[PDB]
Amino acid sequence: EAPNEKTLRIKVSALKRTIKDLEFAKREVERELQRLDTLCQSDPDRVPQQTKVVDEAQMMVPHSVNRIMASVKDLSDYLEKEGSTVSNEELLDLARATMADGQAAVS
């Protein structure tokens, strides 16, 4: 209920969501590339539309990466400021674990 604890929790949850976003976005690229091939053979009048969706799917990967990194920096900055005094050891461990998961997810 400490306001710094509450803010830290929100930032950790936000970061976790950006990481899951990238995972689903990467899985979807592979599907869009398949969805292209399917619609290619079944219905090539849809291929132009799906070519454009595939290209956008691929660009959504760096977009998702950029969001993870912006969230990692925000959390990291907070931990140097009002987050620096949080006494909840397990929340601090979780914040550090989640940052490490984000860094792993990019790279």
Residue numbers in the entry: 19 to 125
Task: Provide the authors' original text about this structure.
In order to underpin dissection of TBC function and delineation of structure–activity relationships, we have instigated studies of the trypanosomatid proteins and now report a crystallographic study of one, TBCA, from Leishmania major. In one model for microtubule biogenesis this TBCD–β-tubulin complex then facilitates α/β-tubulin heterodimer formation.
The structure of LmTBCA was determined by the SAD approach and was refined to 1.9 Å resolution. Helices α1 and α2, each comprising ten helical turns, are distorted, with bends of approximately 20–25°, giving the molecule an overall curved appearance. The proline at position 80 in LmTBCA is strictly conserved in these structures and appears to contribute to a bend in α2 in all cases, although the effect appears most pronounced in the Leishmania protein. The presence of a localized region enriched in basic residues, which are conserved in TBCA from evolutionarily diverse species, together with the overall acidic properties of the C-terminal tails of β-tubulins, hints that electrostatic forces might be relevant for complex formation, but further work is required to address such a hypothesis.
